[PDB]
Design a protein around this ligand. Structure first.
Ligand SMILES: [K+]
Length: 943
């Protein structure tokens, strides 16, 4: 007999008795008065006992005492006699704990919110009981009811019971994450999680509320780039040292790392739950994306879009889900469906999305032609990969464009508060109005300056950024496989060009042709597939801890870039390719020590790169000419500036390319001559538009003596940006002519180049040597890439590098328009003032050339008025005989004797002058010219 040890246990654990004379402060009931009495004491303590304002905390404390009273007893004899009770306590306590989180108004005090509030504040002390409650709910098949009572409620706690649910509230967000982990770890729960009320957004939910009104909202927003977290961590003292600033960057990164790890774990469990769950997971993220495209606008409506912290976290998550399939072995590389866009999109809203090389019509058409294939096919692995590309662009892309602009925002803001800080407000009302205004501005300035530090801390976070770029590289490999006609890459090299090089790009907008011959599925992929990677790559390149620098997978993206820059059919958009070519220029620039750019090794040893890089650059340098957009008609000059930086470096550091160039000019002169023609044409005006602009910059600073002060900015600034771009391209163009004319002099004196070259050179020489450059007054000439001395030295060097080609000295001499010996005399004068020129031997060579030039001119003058009586227009171009039946060639517009072309068309049916196919039928007679000759032969009958 010892059942007294029971009722005494039932009371010390449930903390309740019936007698008023109890020593310890236990609740007391005045109803009736062992084991078969527990359900009664409990039911009472939860529904009729007013002193228990915190019911769930009670049931939890009871359960915990019973577990303590359990481990304490067994280690003794009387043990066996209690087991019966502990058992029934557990069975009912967890049973009501389940009910407390399923039926709303079941207890006499509080509701769901009050209970989970208690749980969040001290999650650890609730863990065990919660575990039991969950198991109980699934064994009974009522887990969803459990979840609809805890997570939708938790959403209310994060939005209403906390000022801000962000990284600041350390204790609170960690506990919330824990109650999330504890739950999703049970698969029976994970496979049902997305069915919870509020997991999806209401149709009328605004994008900025996705992170507030959706179940995964709050925790997915946990990031160091939330304004409140930035102000708190950096706005604190924006004047601290880079050393101290680096410490908080470290703290925030360490903390952010953990956050995405736990977030990944939670989403991973929901994706592994079932096929239904991961599918809803794709629907969930697709919606977040489809409604945030404006995050990529020029002036984004921030208050109507999701935050950078949210979108960026999701981009990171997606990236890890995709990482496995893009590992360096690419063994699972085919799990990703290349025909993903062959049918109407099921998740990612592609309307309005520009394709690589195609329009809507063709896309829809592609959809009809493919309805023959499975209509349904929501393949998760592919969805996730392409969703990652979507977030890379709209999520991260909008976050990086956001901080890329803060510099100008801060500068302009500082000028606004300084302008307002001058106002003298006499009236008290006006004074408050002005101070209020200064208050709003400085309040925004602090947010911006703090957020900028926060954003830089995030992008300098190599660990994370590395994951992002390695995905770009894996994405690259994947895209090259789509393009490769045998879809074998990287297991079998890819063959470039795809379609043979159009010997004569001299066709009517290849647009239609190229598009028609664009790669099968690739031509339909949305443009953000390439723009995302390149916007990102160009952007993080400014950080010292860049993912791109010294990364072993860089080659993949370089290979992809080269492929695009090589086959004009792949991506039509010239603007997009200019970006790529700009990334390459970044990877080609030397350093302080003057060692190879970080991409040079790849350019030299990557097979797919060194086999096409040079030709791609030379070809793209030319194609950007067929561009004409709104504020993008000046990017073809930036593309050329960039292509030029690369050309120069490749030529100095990699003999392999120096040889590819040389070879090119001899084995494919047509292509090579086509490239220097464009460099030549542009060079006839570059220095001129540089001088015109610097002229406008000096006018404006003059008008500033005290028109509309504002417009004189978007103006003056704009003139400087044209001056720097013009003088800069000119400089790189001369260098290239100089750099090449030294090794392949012959290539530049071919008839299609020599006369135009001599003219262009002489024109610039006149400019440099005279009043056009001499009269120009400027601020920091260098700030605009304007070095008239460097230019004059490189120009003069070109002459010297070509001063042994009779054709060139003849061309320079025959240049009526600009040639004049005194120009070289002046040049020799300028170069002989400041120490800068391989002279006086150099000056020796130039002056020599100038002399041969003047001699060649005097001879030509003598030859003309002494040995040429018959006016040149009457002489046949090829026989030099006086024409009897002059006719006009349709293509060349040249006049030639009928007898001559006939003789030519016999073994060659083409225009002797430009090889344009010609037939004798389309030759138009020139009667007016023939009569002038008949008239000449007539008067010539003197004797
Ligand atoms: K938040």
């Amino acid at each position: 007999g010892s059942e007294f040890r029971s009722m005494t246990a039932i009371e010390d654990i449930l903390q309740i008795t019936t007698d008023p004379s109890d020593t310890r402060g236990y609740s007391l009931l005045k109803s009736e008065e062992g084991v078969d009495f527990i359900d009664t004491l409990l039911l009472y303590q939860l529904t009729e006992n007013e002193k228990l304002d915190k019911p769930f905390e009670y049931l939890n404390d009871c359960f915990r005492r019973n577990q303590q009273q359990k481990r304490i007893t067994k280690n003794k004899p009387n043990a066996e006699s209690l087991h019966s009770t502990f058992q029934e306590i557990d069975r009912l306590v967890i049973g009501y704990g389940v009910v407390a989180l399923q039926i709303e108004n079941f207890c006499m005090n509080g509701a769901f919110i009050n209970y989970i509030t208690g749980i969040v504040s001290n999650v650890n002390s609730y863990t065990d009981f919660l575990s039991q409650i969950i198991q109980r709910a699934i064994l009974e098949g009522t887990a969803l009811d459990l979840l609809n009572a805890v997570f939708p409620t938790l959403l209310e706690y994060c939005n209403k019971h906390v000022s801000h649910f962000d990284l600041n509230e350390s204790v609170i967000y960690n506990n919330v994450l824990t109650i999330f982990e504890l739950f999703v770890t049970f698969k029976p729960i994970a496979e049902i999680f997305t069915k919870i009320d509020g997991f999806f957004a209401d149709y009328s939910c605004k994008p900025q509320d996705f992170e507030r009104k959706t179940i995964l909202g709050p925790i997915l927003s946990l990031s160091p780039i939330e304004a409140a977290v930035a102000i708190r961590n950096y706005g604190d003292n924006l004047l601290r040292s880079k050393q101290q600033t680096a410490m908080i960057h470290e703290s925030l990164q360490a903390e952010h790392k953990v956050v995405i790890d736990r977030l990944f774990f939670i989403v991973d469990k929901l994706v592994r739950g079932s096929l239904n769950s991961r599918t809803d997971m794709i629907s969930y993220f697709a919606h977040i994306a489809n409604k945030n495209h404006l995050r990529r606008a020029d002036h984004p409506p921030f208050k109507e879009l999701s935050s950078n912290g949210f979108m960026s976290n999701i981009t990171l998550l997606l990236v890890r889900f995709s990482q496995p399939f893009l590992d360096i072995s690419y063994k699972k590389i085919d799990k990703i469906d290349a025909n993903y866009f062959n049918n109407p999109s099921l998740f990612i809203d592609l309307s309005g999305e520009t394709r690589l090389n195609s329009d809507f019509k063709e896309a829809d058409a592609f959809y009809d032609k493919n309805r023959k294939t499975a209509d349904s096919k929501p393949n998760f692995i592919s969805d996730c990969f392409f969703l990652t590309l979507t977030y890379l662009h709209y999520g991260l892309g909008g976050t990086l464009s956001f901080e890329e602009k803060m510099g100008s925002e801060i500068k302009a803001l500082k000028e606004e508060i300084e302008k307002v800080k001058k106002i003298a407000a006499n009236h008290d009302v006006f004074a408050r109005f002005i101070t209020a205004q200064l208050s709003k501005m400085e309040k925004a300035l602090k947010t911006t300056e703090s957020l900028r530090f926060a954003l830089q801390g995030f992008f300098a976070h190599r660990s994370l950024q590395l994951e992002v770029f390695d995905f770009i590289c894996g994405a690259s490999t994947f895209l090259i496989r789509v393009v490769d006609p045998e879809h074998e890459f990287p297991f079998k090299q890819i063959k470039l060009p795809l379609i043979p090089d159009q010997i004569g790009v001299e066709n009517v907008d290849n647009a239609d042709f190229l598009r028609a011959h664009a790669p099968v599925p690739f031509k339909y992929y949305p443009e953000f597939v390439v723009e995302g990677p390149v916007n990102y790559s160009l952007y993080i390149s400014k950080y010292q801890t860049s993912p791109i620098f010294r990364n072993p997978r860089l080659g993949s993206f370089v290979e992809f870039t080269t492929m695009v820059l090589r086959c004009p059919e792949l991506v039509s958009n010239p603007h997009l390719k200019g970006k790529l070519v700009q990334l390459l220029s970044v990877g080609a620039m030397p350093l302080t020590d003057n060692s190879p750019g970080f991409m040079m090794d790849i350019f030299e040893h990557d097979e797919l790169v060194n086999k096409n890089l040079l030709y791609a650059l030379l070809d793209f340098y030319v194609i950007v000419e067929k561009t004409g957009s709104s504020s993008q008609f000046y990017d073809k000059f930036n593309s050329r500036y960039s292509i030029s930086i690369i050309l120069e470096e490749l030529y100095y550091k990699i003999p392999s390319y120096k040889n590819q160039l040389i070879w090119q000019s001899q084995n494919n002169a047509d292509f090579f001559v086509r490239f220097v023609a464009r460099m030549l044409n542009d060079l006839t005006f570059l220095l001129d538009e540089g001088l015109s602009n610097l002229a406008e910059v000096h006018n404006i600073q003059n008008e500033l003596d005290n028109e509309e002060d504002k417009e004189l900015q978007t103006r003056l600034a704009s003139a400087s940006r044209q001056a720097k771009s013009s003088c800069g391209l000119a400089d790189k163009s001369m260098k290239l002519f100089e750099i090449y004319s030294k090794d392949i002099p012959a290539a530049f004196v071919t008839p299609e180049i020599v006369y135009r070259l001599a003219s262009m050179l002489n024109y610039n020489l006149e400019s440099l040597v005279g009043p056009k450059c001499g009269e120009l007054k400027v601020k920091d000439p260098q700030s605009y890439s304007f070095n008239p001395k460097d230019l004059l030295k490189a120009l003069t060097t070109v002459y010297i590098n070509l001063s042994e080609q009779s054709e060139f000295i003849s061309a320079v001499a025959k240049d009526e328009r600009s040639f004049n010996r005194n120009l070289f005399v002046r040049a020799v004068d300028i170069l002989g003032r400041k120490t800068g020129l391989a002279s006086p031997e150099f000056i020796e060579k130039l002056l020599n050339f100038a002399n041969k030039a003047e001699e060649q001119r005097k001879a030509d003058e003598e030859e003309d008025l002494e040995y040429g009586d018959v006016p040149d227009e009457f002489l046949d171009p090829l026989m030099y005989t006086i024409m009897k039946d002059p006719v006009i060639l349709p293509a060349s517009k040249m006049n030639i004797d009928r007898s001559t072309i006939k003789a030519h068309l016999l073994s060659d049916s083409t225009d002797p002058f430009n090889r344009m196919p010609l037939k004798l039928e389309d030759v138009t007679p020139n009667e007016e010219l023939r009569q002038k000759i008949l008239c000449f032969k007539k008067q010539k009958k003197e004797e």
